[PDB]
Amino acid sequence: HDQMLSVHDIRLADMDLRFQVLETASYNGVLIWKIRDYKRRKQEAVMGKTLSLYSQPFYTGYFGYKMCARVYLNGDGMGKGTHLSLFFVIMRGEYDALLPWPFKQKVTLMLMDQGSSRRHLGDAFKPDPNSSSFKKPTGEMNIASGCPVFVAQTVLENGTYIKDDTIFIKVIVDTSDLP
């Protein structure tokens, strides 16, 4: 009986994460990511406990690409320790066989401005036609791609971006050329 109870606890915990993913799932090609408790997680990134964070999956449509966002609070690569790194990730979708490849929809990475100025920091780019990040996925996720020097850490920590220890990240994927 004890063994079954332990299995039930694991299954119940797994279902709880499943509810949240479906609750925040989006199918309009635009992802809004809310990261609460920024202070403690930024310290964890500095200490190396958690280098990067993964967003909930989002889709261009009901049967579109399965995508997500990856962020480095302390920076990654050349932006380690001085900037914030944001990366765009292509995940394996259940309908990848019916979707055109390589991925070519325009991807815009934006950092929402929580202040009254609404001066959102953004950086738009076109997917590389010959990168492993935008090919047809073979594993669970492909190689993350983005801007390691998206926003400077000092610039981010000058107010209007961290309210109630929470940051907002917006990813916009163009769907005007997708059936």
């Binding site: 990511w33 809310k34 964070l53 967003s55 690569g77 780019f125 990168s131 993350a144 791609s145 983005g146």
Partner: peptide, 17 residues
């Protein structure tokens, strides 16, 4: 505008709430 690859090392935790 040129995409830059990542430096996947580890310590990845999905966060959404």
């Amino acid at each position: 505008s040129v995409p830059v690859p990542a430096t996947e090392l580890g310590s990845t935790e999905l966060v959404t709430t």
